[PDB]
Amino acid sequence: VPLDGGRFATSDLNDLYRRVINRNNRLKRLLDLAAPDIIVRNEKRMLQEAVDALLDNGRRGRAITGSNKRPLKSLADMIKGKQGRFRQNLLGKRVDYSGRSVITVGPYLRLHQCGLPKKMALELFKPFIYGKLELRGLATTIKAAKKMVEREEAVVWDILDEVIREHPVLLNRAPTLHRLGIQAFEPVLIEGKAIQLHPLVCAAYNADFDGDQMAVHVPLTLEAQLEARALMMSTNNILSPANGEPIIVPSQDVVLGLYYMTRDCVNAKGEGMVLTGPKEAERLYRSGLASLHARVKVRITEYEKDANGELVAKTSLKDTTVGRAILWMIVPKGLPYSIVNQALGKKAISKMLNTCYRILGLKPTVIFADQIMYTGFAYAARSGASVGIDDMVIPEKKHEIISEAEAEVAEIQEQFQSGLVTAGERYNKVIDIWAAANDRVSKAMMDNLQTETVINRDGQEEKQVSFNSIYMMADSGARGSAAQIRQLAGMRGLMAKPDGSIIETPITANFREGLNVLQYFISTHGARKGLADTALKTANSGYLTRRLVDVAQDLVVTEDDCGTHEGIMMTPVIEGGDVKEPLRDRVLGRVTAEDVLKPGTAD
Amino acid sequence: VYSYTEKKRIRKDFGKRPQVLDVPYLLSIQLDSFQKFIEQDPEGQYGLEAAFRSVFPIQSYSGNSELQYVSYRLGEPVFDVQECQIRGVTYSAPLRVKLRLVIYEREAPEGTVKDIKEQEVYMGEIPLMTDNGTFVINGTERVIVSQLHRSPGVFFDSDKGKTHSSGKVLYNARIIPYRGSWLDFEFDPKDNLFVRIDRRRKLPATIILRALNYTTEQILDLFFEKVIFEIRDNKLQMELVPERLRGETASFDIEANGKVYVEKGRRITARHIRQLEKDDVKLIEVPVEYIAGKVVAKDYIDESTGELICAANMELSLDLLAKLSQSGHKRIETLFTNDLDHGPYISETLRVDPTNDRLSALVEIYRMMRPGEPPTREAAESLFENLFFSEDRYDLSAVGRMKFNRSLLREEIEGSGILSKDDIIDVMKKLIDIRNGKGEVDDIDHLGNRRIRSVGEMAENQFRVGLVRVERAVKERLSLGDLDTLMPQDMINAKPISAAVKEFFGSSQLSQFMDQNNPLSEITHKRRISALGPGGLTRERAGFEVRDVHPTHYGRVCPIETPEGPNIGLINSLSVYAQTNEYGFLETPYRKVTDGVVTDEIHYLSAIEEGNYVIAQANSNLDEEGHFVEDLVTCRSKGESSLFSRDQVDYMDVSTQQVVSVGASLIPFLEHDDANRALMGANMQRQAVPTLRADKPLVGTGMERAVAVDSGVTAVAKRGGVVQYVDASRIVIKVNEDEMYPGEAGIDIYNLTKYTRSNQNTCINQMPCVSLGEPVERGDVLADGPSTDLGELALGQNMRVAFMPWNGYNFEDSILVSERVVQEDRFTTIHIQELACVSRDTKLGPEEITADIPNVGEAALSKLDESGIVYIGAEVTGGDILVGKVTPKGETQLTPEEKLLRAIFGEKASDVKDSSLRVPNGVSGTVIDVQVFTRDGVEKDKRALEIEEMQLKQAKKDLSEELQILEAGLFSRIRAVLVAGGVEAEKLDKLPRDRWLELGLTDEEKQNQLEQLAEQYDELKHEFEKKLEAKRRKITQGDDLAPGVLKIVKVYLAVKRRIQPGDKMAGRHGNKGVISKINPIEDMPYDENGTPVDIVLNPLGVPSRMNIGQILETHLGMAAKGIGDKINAMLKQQQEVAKLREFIQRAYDLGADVRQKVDLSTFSDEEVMRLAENLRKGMPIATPVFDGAKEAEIKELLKLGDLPTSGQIRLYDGRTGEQFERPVTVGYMYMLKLNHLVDDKMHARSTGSYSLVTQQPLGGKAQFGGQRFGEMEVWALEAYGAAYTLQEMLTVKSDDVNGRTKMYKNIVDGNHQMEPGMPESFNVLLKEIRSLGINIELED
Amino acid sequence: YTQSWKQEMIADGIEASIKGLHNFDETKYKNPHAYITQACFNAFVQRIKKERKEVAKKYSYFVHNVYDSRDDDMVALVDETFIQDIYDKMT
Ligand SMILES: [Mg+2]
16 A cells, blocks of 8 residues: 555556466466366466456457446556646656745836745755854754754744845646746745745746646756756846747836826927926926926937947937926937827837847846836836716717617618518628627727827817826736727627527617626636636647647757758748738848848849 | 514615515425325325336236335434534435235136235335425535436437538437437438438438338328329320419420410410409310329229239320220329429438348348348347337326327327327327428527426435335246245335435446535525436537527526536526426416416416516516506517517516526626626536634625525524523524424524535534524524624625725736735635544454554644544644554564564564554644544543533533423422411422422312322423433444444544635625735825725726726715714714614615615614614625616615715825825725635645656655646747757656766765656557567667 | 456366366266366365465555544445455355
């Protein structure tokens, strides 16, 4: 019996063995009796089936079920499947010096570090603590050390402190998709029970903060600390290996902050005055003497190492908004201002990060990103970007478009029912008319919402981008689809069918107003559909990536230059109509064999 | 007008639609089933009675001795529930049966009974169902979730598509019995028709037919029509009725009477045939050659040869016509043929038949069934025989025969349980028609076919299993009938039936622990239906289709509530009103829509009988007269919806919420949220662990009363009366008399439980809510359970909540809290873990529960008692000892290091060793109670005696009160008899009232009455003594043990886990999250009025998760609280009642026309105050699911408060006191505490045990297990050049035993350096392949 | 109960009948049918008792090991291995 804790297993091998050996002796014994050869044949058969069932059960007619209606395990079953030695214990293997817990944020952290509770911290380093104590003489024997560590003789902590000084840790999530699902950090000790987290990296981990559970391991050898240090530290993993995209995208709320910052009101406090330094900008903001999103002339300067490494600086006067400058005080050296004068949704900050990394190196970039998160969180906080029953504007003419649509469809239906058209094309017409009304009410709402700024400018009024928290997110692109809005305000058209057909009459309602029973029922069905598909999709993706990783599994850069001038002539792709990848991309970062000419010959 | 216990806190209810039908009693399913399982009634038709009158009577092997059954009775609960809960015994009863053995006079059946010999026989111990529809198996409380399966009968499967990819559609038909063996008929890609049995190999159905003793000519007769020839002078004028000539081309001029009607090479129209019937043609010209393909009908003999000129099914040829027609049998028969009207598929099956007779047919039957055996005719005979017509191995339940003749459209509901040759032929005919193109298939999940089981049904099934076993046995027993030396018991083994029953309950995947941490989940875990286990698909056999929703699910199964993950729709739940048809089918209440009235009459309708009708949706008005005030109304007939006439419709729904399960009927503003979010909402709602206090949610759904009263944890009076003695431990009501029975005027005594363990370690207790002296009516709430409140369900706490970003501390889903709630500890929860230590006897001698333990610091020992049982209140932690229990040593386990001391001290030293019950590392807490169990007649120690004396003193108390209350009426009547005739003033009271028959009253019949009622007094005294000492015996006594043990002790740790950064909280709207940080009060955003706000959610939540419901809830809740600050203020400053009631009535007006219509001028003005103080905390609001509260009423009430109608207001930072531009939204929202607590999740492992077959560090958290390090991670590591990491990872920290030891040393002595080594479990594989002869090796 | 056992059972019974055919009077016991019948019957019961108490022995060995790694033991199961290991031992 294994008896290794828990329920006990039966290690049923012997049983077969037992019964197997049994028959063997019987055979001899019966041969020893000069048995009627018919039955000696029978016993030979029993023996053969026995050794069979020992080697690989099931390959015959009736696999010998163990008991409780279960097949038992041969020598082969220990080998195959996702539980045989290979896929169970040769490759995947539970390991010591490890821990697991729930996760939280802790935004005070900078990039290269992770929170870590006191307790797990204590166990994960017990050997280190012992070594340190007995080097210090504070204990004398290992047993002394065990006792000291037991009841936390208050020295211990500082001991542990010394041990952590730069000792890395390695963090991971459960479904490890790619090269960044597991990284390194340098922890800071918490008198808590959960794990903080530098709120940027959470994208790589594809991780919500709704009860995820992270795992943590610890390198032992100095070599191991080094490996982790240079090669799996967050300060080393910023460009998604799938594509040279910076993978540190400030995700959603920093986004809302920044967007709310870089923007302009039609006429705010002290708009359009003149200033001479973003210091003054800060002051006039906090002093409450100047609003934030307001046009203003300000003197600034900027740099560039366009010359031979030398970031020559030079001034000018611009007309911008305050927060533009306020942020601008942070933008590091080698950047021109026009990078910032825009209203700064999300992809803007993305490409800004990228060019910064490209021209500047690495450390400027990380310091930059950190400061960015700080500022964004802060200013979003100051904003008060709430949302309520008034954030959802409504198309007044919704009922209009809908009433006319249904009026027509009644007509075309009584036309068919009078026997004037075919049912299939009548259905098609209904499809198309509901699509028409759909898009029309979409335009109605979206437009009405997106522009309702009407505020005098010492004169009559002007109409610029409005400020609906909803709309503010959307135009920010921080979170939410335009179609999400569409559903909120516009009727969310028509849904699917268990087949994939579509119901004749659409969902006429919004979420502002309440759904009636039937529409809601239908939506229910569709959602259940999508969920089951989520399950199956994860499933199949599993075995797919399995085969994929398995097929290469061995390709390694062995050399430098295979000594050849061939390859393939890449070109932009044209789907016949519009082109999709500019030639700039297929080439970017792919060593060319031949040189290139100009369209002009010999060039 | 309301329940006088409703008047205690009346919640306002928006909502415009009235109701015609109440919610029914929810748990009614289990109740009705199990009731129906044990019910002595005529014909039984079900339950025990059924199996009994089936298997019995029964007799010898024609040995002229019979065993007959008569009647039965269920014995008794020897104890009651809580008793079993204490011990751990199955709440059950025995079954007393009436039987008789009757042997027969010699050589005559009717020959007199050799002996009428009957007896009462003991058999089985069936469990029993509590009044809450649960079970008690071993102390614990399991539940039997009901199944749902494919009803028995016959079904017409399509299997479109992938059959052969040819584009053609195959077909099949399947008969399924309740019990027995199925049967299948189906096609080949070549229009060949075949039978299949037990899903085994395929055989030609012709073989079955042969088995039916069927001349192939009779087969041909069955299927095809007839065609008649007569040999003419020439050209073979065939008989014709013109119809069958619809759809044929004229290869010859269709003519009669000479006048041709069709030209050579003309495809005849239908109208031709019409005018031809008008011509009434019967005989027609035929080119004999055209008759080449018409196969013969059947055989044909000759006369001179007297020999078969043709055998049945011979291919017709011209010379063959010569032979035939020559013999003058002018009557010729062949078969009708067609392709798109009558496909001739039987003929070819006949062709392929290798068989000749019924007998070789049976031979084939055997061969296909049991392979390779050289058959005996009789073998196959018996096989097929009992295969399909003997009750031993086949049955259709009544529902079977019903569905069978139904799908066959026949007109009988009754029949047999077994088949008939007809039936099979009828199947085949129907399927053939389907194949031609007349007839439609069925689909799987159409609820018109899926029937539903229950507890009683499967109960009696297992019962039948056991009964059949004992049948075999006792039959062979009566076989050796020793005449008259046998009562009808001696043959009877009553063990195995009880064995099977106990198995079923204690072991069946249709049985699990009652999910027990909420009056909600306790009720969700009964109104739940699945299709898993015996008779259902498999969790990874799951087909897509079943896992979806069928429009027929309307009001029969919750569309939205099912536990997501690896299974959806399989563990779906049941809706509100949905009943169960007697056949295990579903029905639904429905109102009649007569000429112009949607009347108040209602019925219950199936999933198919429904299809004939159009039925009105809910949210559409009528003119108080059934006339839809509109004209084109939203309705539905069959998988459809449309606008319908004012008079097309037939029925209407009963109430909106009849679409969903109760686990959603609460989450308010539902029609403002997506389904997905609604799903997560209901599920995460099902797990709201009950916290310390209990406050109601302010915004409800108007449907939380019928949850509690139908749940169990409540305590409810059984008849009105007066509260007479409350106490935090028990309740004593004096019943009122008109609600009282003659004997035992009596007092309802409710013994609320105090803190006891829930099945997942959460406290429970039934605290009272009543005032001493107050009256209650017949059926009011008396004491409240976990997360309950005065009959109101209350699963979480409602909190002032704000919506805004804040320093990322609500970045992803971080919920951010102030100290001030944990200051109030309003989210604390206790926990209860039962620990147990037993005393069995191994070899080497039994064991002790002494306080005498070796090699342990006496410091610890002190904490125990003299017995060895630590005291009540000792705050304990892990790595300690709670009981001392010691064992003899044994030999093979003796180390020299003690061989020394046993040598020296004399072997009286190392004879024993510790087994003490420790404190499970990782726990702390406080002891609450200790149970100690011992064999009776075996010595009982101090603690045992203490529990004894306590419990008996207690149990005496109530009955003491009983007698002293019920008796005094006797002295009432006594002095009433002494009053008339010189009543005495101070003799009757200053002296003992017993001292009344010692004073001489003028001795007439009144002193006779004195002595009479005195004897009656003393008799009632003594029989009260009888009762109480019966109780004393029962309680004082010990308790039997599963022999092999001596005595056992159970201890009840407890812990109050409060809250911490890491826990999981969420609102009913699937908006979950972990509380990240808890700052000081000073930093929470505060309003101008000083009051800070508890929690600050995130704004981003709504766009992605389009669930508006949260925001609308919050606004409404701010409104609802906005009545508090009104009433509370108006009241604190003192106030007369006039204005109070005035403002009350006003606030209750507040809306469009609803059903509420309450009035307060009713009250006697004090209960007014009571109500007001109930309100003082805030005003409770009700809003049904789809009869909600539109925005306008919300704006209104908001104004009736004092608030800005937006709901948004301005707020200030608490760290700069400055204003927040862009005013934000705060309100009051119900938050729940999800029971995934961090302290249950955190777990480390420096180093610990290892598995032994392979030395990999063990897994799981109970074991000190190391994390799972996977192949994906392996790759993610190889992507980097992370070599040493991966190596030292997977060897030095996992398996390299030598290596890991060397490491451990070097690290604990200051040397980070690795020795590679080589894995161990690898060697395990190496030897494992060395097992088989595949010699493996490791070259140089 | 169990196909696997049943195989060995029948094996036993067959050998038993084989050897026991050696001695079968004819003048008495005019039937060999029941002879072989009860012969195999006894062979079967022998085999089954052997196997029953073997797996019983397994249970017995098991229940004498509760000292595996740390705290947090179980009470429910152990009693059942115990109670079987007792019932079988009753015989
Ligand atoms: Mg997650």
